[PDB]
């Protein structure tokens with residue numbers, strides 16, 4: 527998957543497509559919009575291909591990662607989703623939305639203490655009051 | 669992966685990991701790099717193998733390459749802010765002090781590792 531690609535790229539230390547600016551920013555924006563067009567019309571398999579394409583090109587992009595993580599979560603590929611959410615959080619450290627979704631994934635993966643830690647972090651650190659309510663509703667259940 | 673099919677026994681993998689750090693500790697960086705690349709080929713998902721390779725890139729002053737791997741290492745760990753701390757160090761060297769500050773702040777806010785938190789704070793004190 528997208529993480530494997532990122533690690534293989536890092537091990538080999540060869541020139542990537544991003545290194546040579548093979549795809550312009552505006553074209554990447556277009557592909558991203560097309561990815562969401564597919565997603566919004568329920569063409570999830572095509573959206574997944576498009577988000578995988580984007581993440582091969584530019585793995586270290588929070589919005590690309592978030593798109594793909596959303597797909598894996600819908601498909602109940604919870605571990606894969608949780609992993610990408612954690613990448614997304616790391617690169618965009620100020621948004622607790624990926625931490626909240628990691629919590630949901632962890633609960634489904636039968637790791638309630640890990641999920642609790644996620645929801646607690648949202649409550650402690652997020653300024654998103656609506657997200658905090660959602661996190662608390664999960665904490666109440668666990 | 670090669671780990672998925674248990675291509676090399678667990679005890680041998682432990683030995684190779686120890687040998688990788690033996691090279692690293694003795695400043696045999698080129699050999700440590702080969703060994704950590706080997707380990708990361710065998711198991712791309714292993715947080716400690718990724719952390720070892722990232723440490724090599726950081727020592728070799730390939731700071732962005734190190735930062736990238738640290739981000740992967742954090743993501744797969746979900747339990748360890750050590751890679752976020754080292755990302756902070758990389759960012760300072762990459763002349764991105766606000767990004768570094770965000771890294772060290774995250775360590776202070778989230779980590780339960782008291783020794784790591786002291787190290788992160790000492791960097792925050794220095795950032796202008």
Ligand SMILES: C[C@H]1CC[C@H](NC(=O)Cn2ccnc2)CC1
Pocket residue numbers: 611612613615624625628643644647746747748778779780
């Ligand atoms: C994206 C998520 C970010 C938050 C992560 N949880 C924790 O930081 C909990 N923890 C464990 C040890 N010290 C703190 C889980 C992933």
Ligand SMILES: [Cl-]
Pocket residue numbers: 763764765766767768
């Ligand atoms: Cl900066």
Ligand SMILES: [Mg+2]
Pocket residue numbers: 649650651652653
């Ligand atoms: Mg608050």
